[PDB]
Design a binder for this molecule. Sequence first.
Ligand SMILES: CCCN1CC(Nc2ccc([C@@H]3c4ccc5[nH]ncc5c4C[C@@H](C)N3CC(F)(F)F)nc2)C1
Lengths: 227, 238
Amino acid sequence: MALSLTADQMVSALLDAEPPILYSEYPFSEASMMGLLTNLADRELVHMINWAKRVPGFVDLTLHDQVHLLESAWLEILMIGLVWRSMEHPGKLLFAPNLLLDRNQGKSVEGMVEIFDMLLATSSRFRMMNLQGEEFVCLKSIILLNSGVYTFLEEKDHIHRVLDKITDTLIHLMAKAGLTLQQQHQRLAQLLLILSHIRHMSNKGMEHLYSMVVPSYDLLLEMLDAH
Amino acid sequence: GSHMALSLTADQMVSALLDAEPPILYSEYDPTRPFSEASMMGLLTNLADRELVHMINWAKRVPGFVDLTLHDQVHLLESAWLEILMIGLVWRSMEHPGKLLFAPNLLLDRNQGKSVEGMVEIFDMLLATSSRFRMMNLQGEEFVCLKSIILLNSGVYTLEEKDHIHRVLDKITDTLIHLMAKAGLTLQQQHQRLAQLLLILSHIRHMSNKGMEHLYSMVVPSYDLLLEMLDAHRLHAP
Ligand SMILES: CCCN1CC(Nc2ccc([C@@H]3c4ccc5[nH]ncc5c4C[C@@H](C)N3CC(F)(F)F)nc2)C1
């Protein structure tokens, strides 16, 4: 079913599966801000599972394979969402409609301001590139499928085939937007190189999170099996 | 004369990158004394230090690099030096399944990595990257473009100078796509292959982040040392 879609059906499916916008719990301190981010991150987690279950090809995997991808990708997925949302708010991180924070606010927690600066710079980068919605969901899917792939294999080829298909889909969007051939491979390159920065941000996030917790394999399996 | 980076054709980009390539270095031990008489970390640290000096010289020959300020050259080098060692390693390990070719006299397997702690996770990741590169039949011409991408893109996110780096990156991408056109891949194959290569770079970044964590837990080249090294290059005999 997955590999037979057209790039149009690929985009539609990806657009449909998109999680809802969530609010933060209805001035701020360290403990205050971390509690609010944690509770928001925890509630986005449940919706991210529902989102993952609708990414074509993902339900074709064994449950163990699904947990491994989500375990590797979850923080990258929250960060790409955040950076997407904060595109039109220079200097600001849009965590939720009622939770828009500046870098000064990032100084509320020790060691968090670095992460904030990197997230702001990525946001400004995607804004500069005029990232479109249809391209965003394609990238978010690539993170899910790529992030854990080299850290688990007839099923390895299967993931790679979906990845190839998302690449096709990205190109097709770029051609429908009237980019030249040359411009198409250049934009593709620019988008995928940003993924390395997201991976880096995620690793710095985990480090900070382990200086204090991260969703366990068991919890992830539970939620994935509960769907 | 002097070429400007942005003027180069695909063939001139490749040739500049091929000619910039550093030599394969040997590990420094006495082949008479047993490998039980030496530290694993000792050998790797010594090799990495010597590779770093060549990495300076190599970075200066990447088109566009010297167009940047000293300060910017140093920031890029500081953020991508481990990823550069790591991609060189995965490349030369390609024909040695299950083994990492640190040097022609330092070919290590998994069980050998379990001696230093934390080091086994990284070894496994390096081995899988290496087998991914094999399965794709990565070419030397492609490897040089990837290595240059890493150098310029690793610290670009961390301002009209940025347009320049951005243009250089576009040129390297053009070069990769020319290489794949010349080798007879269709358009869709070219895009797919390019995508597969760039995604492997995120994995290398991951590996470098874990490498760095391990080294901070123990020496990492500081902004100042690198500054000293790039500045010292100007006093080297051409
Ligand atoms: C100039 C000041 C001192 N510098 C600090 C550095 N020490 C150092 C020691 C060991 C390593 C080794 C190493 C050594 C040699 C290499 N050649 N190619 C790849 C390669 C690698 C990659 C990895 C396996 N790596 C370990 C880890 F970092 F990932 F954990 N890398 C660096 C020298």
